[PDB]
Write an enzyme that holds these catalytic residues in place. Structure first.
Site, PDB file in Angstrom:
ATOM      1  N   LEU A   1     -48.465 -34.716 -24.354  1.00  0.00           N
ATOM      2  CA  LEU A   1     -49.535 -34.545 -23.851  1.00  0.00           C
ATOM      3  C   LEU A   1     -49.990 -35.460 -22.769  1.00  0.00           C
ATOM      4  O   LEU A   1     -49.515 -36.516 -22.844  1.00  0.00           O
ATOM      5  CB  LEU A   1     -50.721 -34.442 -24.831  1.00  0.00           C
ATOM      6  CG  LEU A   1     -50.642 -33.698 -26.009  1.00  0.00           C
ATOM      7  CD1 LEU A   1     -51.533 -33.576 -27.010  1.00  0.00           C
ATOM      8  CD2 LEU A   1     -50.873 -32.076 -25.488  1.00  0.00           C
ATOM      9  N   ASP A   2     -50.881 -34.915 -21.689  1.00  0.00           N
ATOM     10  CA  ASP A   2     -51.211 -35.479 -20.524  1.00  0.00           C
ATOM     11  C   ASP A   2     -52.102 -36.565 -20.837  1.00  0.00           C
ATOM     12  O   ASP A   2     -52.544 -36.928 -21.994  1.00  0.00           O
ATOM     13  CB  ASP A   2     -51.223 -34.771 -19.472  1.00  0.00           C
ATOM     14  CG  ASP A   2     -50.188 -34.057 -18.934  1.00  0.00           C
ATOM     15  OD1 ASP A   2     -49.071 -34.333 -19.016  1.00  0.00           O
ATOM     16  OD2 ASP A   2     -50.377 -32.914 -18.390  1.00  0.00           O
ATOM     17  N   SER A   3     -52.690 -37.178 -19.596  1.00  0.00           N
ATOM     18  CA  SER A   3     -53.698 -38.221 -19.829  1.00  0.00           C
ATOM     19  C   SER A   3     -55.090 -37.488 -19.924  1.00  0.00           C
ATOM     20  O   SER A   3     -56.179 -38.150 -19.679  1.00  0.00           O
ATOM     21  CB  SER A   3     -53.890 -39.289 -18.606  1.00  0.00           C
ATOM     22  OG  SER A   3     -53.318 -38.521 -17.674  1.00  0.00           O
ATOM     23  N   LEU A   4     -55.117 -36.190 -19.908  1.00  0.00           N
ATOM     24  CA  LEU A   4     -56.500 -35.222 -20.112  1.00  0.00           C
ATOM     25  C   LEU A   4     -56.294 -34.239 -21.274  1.00  0.00           C
ATOM     26  O   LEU A   4     -57.340 -33.779 -21.739  1.00  0.00           O
ATOM     27  CB  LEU A   4     -56.828 -34.688 -18.765  1.00  0.00           C
ATOM     28  CG  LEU A   4     -56.989 -35.370 -17.653  1.00  0.00           C
ATOM     29  CD1 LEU A   4     -56.952 -34.564 -16.391  1.00  0.00           C
ATOM     30  CD2 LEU A   4     -57.953 -36.538 -17.595  1.00  0.00           C
TER      31      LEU A   4
END
Ligand SMILES: CCCCCCCCCCCCCCCCCC(=O)OC[C@H](COP(=O)([O-])OCC(O)COP(=O)([O-])OC[C@@H](COC(=O)CCCCCCCCCCCCCCCCC)OC(=O)CCCCCCCCCCCCCCCCC)OC(=O)CCCCCCCCCCCCCCCCC
Ligand SMILES: CCCCCCCCCCCCCCCCCC(=O)OC[C@H](COP(=O)(O)OCCN)OC(=O)CCCCCCCCCCCCCCCCC
Ligand SMILES: CCCCCCCCCCCCCCCCCC(=O)OC[C@H](COP(=O)(O)OCCN)OC(=O)CCCCCCCCCCCCCCCCC
Ligand SMILES: CCCCCCCCCCCCO[C@H]1O[C@H](CO)[C@@H](O[C@H]2O[C@@H](CO)[C@H](O)[C@H](O)[C@@H]2O)[C@H](O)[C@H]1O
Lengths: 88, 82, 108, 62, 92, 76
Positions: free
Chosen positions: A43-46
Site C-alpha cells: 500500500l502507498d503513502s495514501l
C-alpha cells in the site's frame, strides 16, 4: 435494546473484510494479524490513509494524526479499535 | 453552558416583565386581570405601549423570537423528552 | 525553508492534508456516490503531484492546498457522538471511586 | 478523655460500645445511633420551638 | 549587671493544638499566583491611556449622564390612573 | 494573539509572566490533559485574563471572522 458487544475476533473479521474489498491490496491471503500495510499488503503513502478512514467509518471512531500515523500493522489497528470504548 | 444561556436570556425578559409589573401597579393600582381589562380602554396609549413593550420583550425571550432566540437551539443539549 | 519532498515530515503533512480533504468531502456531500467521486478525484490530484522534486514548487503547492482546505471548510462537521465535539461526550461520566477525606476531628 | 475518644473515632472509625453483660469494651463499627452532639438539646428544644412560637404570634397578630 | 531578661521566665513554643487533617487540596502554584495577582492588583495599578479612559467614563461621564436625566426627570411624570388625552407630564 | 484588553495590562504585570492567551476551546481535544474537561495541565501558567480564555468563557466561532459576521448579520 442495544444488545451488542464488540470482541477482538469481531474487529479482526471486519478489518480483514475491509482490506479484502480494497482493490489496491496485493491480493488476498496476505491479510492476517501480523500483516504490514506498507511491505506485505503493498500500500502507498495514501492508501494507508484510506484504510484508516475506512476503519473510522466502520467502527464509528475519530482517529487523530498522532494515532493515525502509528498504525502500520493490522494487529495495531485491532489493538487500537479494541482500546476505544465507543468502537460500536 | 446551554442552561446558563437559557436562564440568563430569559431573566433578561423577566427584568422587562418586572418593569411592566411596576408600571401596571402604578397606573392601574392593581395586578388583577378583572380591573386591568375593565379599565384598559380608558388609559393613555403611551403607558399601555410601555407596559406591552416590556411584556412583549419578556415574551420575545420566552417564545424564542429572533433577537432572543439563541437559547432555544442550545437547549437541545438536554434529553429529548425535555 | 526546506520542505524535503521525500521525507517523513512531508509524509505526515501530506497524509494529514489528504485526511482533511476526504473528511471535508464527506461533510459537505450528502450523497454517497458523489462523495466517492470526489474522493477519487482528490486522490487523482494528489497522485498527479506525488512526483514533484523541486522544493520551491512543492512549497507553493502545499500552500495552495492549505488555501483550498481553508476555502472549503465546513461549519458543522460530522463527529461521532461519544467523541469530544459530540452530543454524548461527557454525558454520564463514571465517578472516581475516592474515599472520604476528613477535615474535622468532631464532624462526620 | 475527650481527645482520646475523638482521635480514635476519626483514625480508627470506631466508637467504643460496652455490651450488656460482658465487662469488656472495645472499638466497634456500629454508628447508626448511640451518639449525640452537644448543641442538639439547646437548639432543637429551645430555639426551634421559639421560632415556631414567633411564626404563631406573627400569624395571629396579622 | 548585664541587662538581660529574668531567668525566672520559663518559655516554651506556641502550640495552637489543631488536629492536622489530611491534604484535601493539591495546590497548583500557577493558580495561586494568578489569584495573588488578581487580589492585590491594587498595589500595581498605574494610570495610562487605557485606564484613564475607563476612569473618566465610569466616574465622570456616566454619573453626569444619570444626574442630568435624574434632575430633569425629577417631578416630570405623574401617571397614576391617567386617561386618554390627559398629559402624563407636569411640565414642558 | 494578545488583544486590546490583554496588552493594556502590560504596565501592571510586574513580575507576573506575560503569557500569550490562546483559548482552551480551540486547543486540541484529542491530546491528554490532567483536566481533560478544562483542557489544562497542572502547572500551566495562566494569563492575567484567564477568566476570558478558559472553557467556561463564552464560545468562540472559528468559521467567520467577527467583522465579516457582523457584515452578514446586519446585511440580512
Ligand atoms: C424579622 C421577622 C422574621 C420572620 C421570620 C419568620 C419565622 C421563622 C420561622 C422558622 C421556623 C423554623 C422551625 C424549626 O426550627 O425547625 C427546625 C428543623 C430543622 O430542620 P432539620 O430537619 O432538623 O435539619 C437537619 C437535617 O434534617 C439533618 O440532615 P438530614 O439527614 O435529615 O438531611 C435531609 C435534608 C437534606 O436535603 C437537602 O439537602 C435538600 C435541601 C433542604 C431544603 C429545605 C427547604 C424546605 C423545602 C420545603 C418544600 C415545600 C415546597 C412548597 O432535607 C431536609 O431536611 C428537608 C426535608 C423536606 C421535607 C420532608 C417532607 C415531609 C412532608 O425543622 C423542622 O423540624 C420542621 C420545620 C418545618 C416548618 C415549616 C412551616 C410549615 C407551615 C405549615 C403550612 C400551612 C399552615 C401555615 C400557617 C401556620 C399558622 C400557625
Ligand atoms: C474624578 C476622580 C479623578 C481621580 C484622579 C486621581 C489622580 C491620582 O490619584 O494621581 C495619582 C498620582 C500618581 O500616579 P501614578 O503615576 O500612576 O503612580 C506613581 C507611580 N509611577 O499621584 C498624584 O496625583 C499626587 C497627588 C497628591 C496631591 C495631594 C493634594 C493635597 C491633599 C490635601
Ligand atoms: C456592557 C454593559 C451592559 C450593561 C447593560 C446590560 C446589558 C445586558 C447584559 C449584558 C452584560 C454582559 C453579560 C456577560 C455574561 C457572560 C457570563 C457567561 O460566561 O455566560 C455565558 C453564557 C453563554 O454560554 P455559551 O458560550 O453561549 O455556551 C453555549 C453552548 N451551550 O452567556 C449568556 O448566558 C448570556 C446572558 C446575557 C444575555 C443578554 C442578551 C442581550 C441581547 C439583546 C438583544 C436585543 C433585543 C431587543 C431588546 C430591545 C430593548 C429596547
Ligand atoms: C478626569 C478627572 C477630571 C474630571 C473631574 C470632574 C470633577 C468636576 C469638576 C468641575 C467643577 C466645575 O463646577 C462648576 O459648578 C458650579 C455649579 O455647579 C459653577 O458655578 C455656578 O454655580 C452655581 C451654583 O450651582 C452658581 O450659583 C452660579 O450659577 C455659577 O454659574 C462653577 O463654575 C463650577 O465650579
Amino acid at each position: 435494546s442495544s444488545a451488542h458487544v464488540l470482541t477482538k475476533d469481531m474487529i479482526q473479521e471486519r478489518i480483514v473484510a475491509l482490506l479484502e474489498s480494497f482493490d489496491k491490496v496485493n491480493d488476498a491471503k496476505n491479510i492476517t494479524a501480523t500483516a504490514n500495510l506498507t511491505s506485505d499488503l503493498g500500500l502507498d503513502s495514501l492508501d494507508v490513509v484510506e484504510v484508516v478512514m475506512a476503519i473510522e467509518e466502520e467502527f464509528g471512531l475519530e482517529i487523530p494524526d498522532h494515532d493515525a500515523d502509528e498504525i502500520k500493522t493490522v494487529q495495531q489497528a485491532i489493538d487500537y479499535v479494541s482500546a476505544q470504548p465507543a468502537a460500536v | 453552558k446551554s442552561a446558563l444561556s437559557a436562564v440568563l436570556m430569559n431573566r433578561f425578559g423577566d427584568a422587562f416583565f418586572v418593569l411592566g409589573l411596576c408600571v401596571i401597579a402604578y397606573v392601574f393600582g392593581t395586578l388583577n386581570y378583572s380591573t386591568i381589562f375593565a379599565t384598559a380602554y380608558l388609559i393613555n396609549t403611551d403607558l399601555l405601549v410601555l407596559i406591552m413593550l416590556a411584556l412583549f420583550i419578556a415574551a420575545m425571550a420566552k417564545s424564542a423570537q429572533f433577537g432572543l432566540h439563541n437559547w432555544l437551539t442550545l437547549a437541545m443539549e438536554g434529553p429529548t423528552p425535555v | 525553508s526546506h520542505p524535503v519532498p521525500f521525507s517523513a515530515a512531508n509524509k505526515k503533512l501530506v497524509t494529514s492534508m489528504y485526511r482533511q480533504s476526504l473528511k471535508l468531502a464527506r461533510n459537505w456531500i450528502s450523497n454517497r456516490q458523489l462523495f466517492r467521486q470526489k474522493a477519487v478525484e482528490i486522490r487523482h490530484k494528489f497522485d498527479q503531484n506525488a512526483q514533484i522534486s523541486n522544493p520551491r514548487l512543492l512549497a507553493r503547492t502545499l500552500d495552495e492546498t492549505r488555501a483550498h482546505l481553508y476555502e472549503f471548510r465546513h461549519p458543522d462537521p460530522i463527529v461521532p457522538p461519544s467523541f469530544p465535539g459530540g452530543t454524548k461526550y461527557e454525558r454520564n461520566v463514571p465517578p472516581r471511586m475516592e474515599k472520604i477525606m476528613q477535615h474535622n476531628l468532631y464532624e462526620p | 478523655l475527650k481527645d482520646y475518644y475523638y482521635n480514635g473515632r476519626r483514625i480508627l472509625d470506631k466508637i467504643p460500645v460496652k455490651d450488656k453483660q460482658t465487662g469488656k469494651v472495645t472499638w466497634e463499627i456500629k454508628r447508626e445511633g448511640a451518639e449525640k452532639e452537644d448543641w442538639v438539646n439547646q437548639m432543637y428544644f429551645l430555639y426551634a420551638p421559639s421560632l415556631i412560637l414567633l411564626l404563631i404570634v406573627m400569624v395571629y397578630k396579622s | 549587671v548585664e541587662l538581660k531578661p529574668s531567668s525566672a521566665i520559663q518559655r516554651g513554643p506556641l502550640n495552637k493544638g489543631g488536629w492536622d487533617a489530611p491534604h484535601a487540596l493539591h495546590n497548583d502554584g500557577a493558580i495561586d499566583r494568578y489569584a495573588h495577582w488578581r487580589t492585590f492588583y491594587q498595589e500595581r495599578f498605574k494610570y495610562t491611556r487605557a485606564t484613564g479612559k475607563s476612569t473618566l467614563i465610569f466616574l465622570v461621564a456616566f454619573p453626569a449622564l444619570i444626574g442630568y436625566v435624574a434632575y430633569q426627570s425629577e417631578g416630570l411624570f405623574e401617571f397614576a390612573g391617567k386617561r386618554r388625552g390627559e398629559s402624563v407630564t407636569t411640565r414642558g | 494573539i494578545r488583544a486590546s484588553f490583554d496588552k493594556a495590562e502590560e504596565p501592571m504585570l510586574g513580575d507576573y509572566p506575560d503569557i500569550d492567551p490562546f483559548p482552551a476551546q480551540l486547543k486540541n481535544p484529542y491530546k491528554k490533559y490532567d483536566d481533560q474537561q478544562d483542557r489544562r495541565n497542572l502547572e500551566e501558567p495562566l494569563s492575567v485574563n484567564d477568566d476570558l480564555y478558559d472553557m467556561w468563557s463564552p464560545d468562540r466561532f472559528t468559521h467567520f471572522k467577527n467583522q465579516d459576521a457582523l457584515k452578514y448579520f446586519i446585511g440580512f
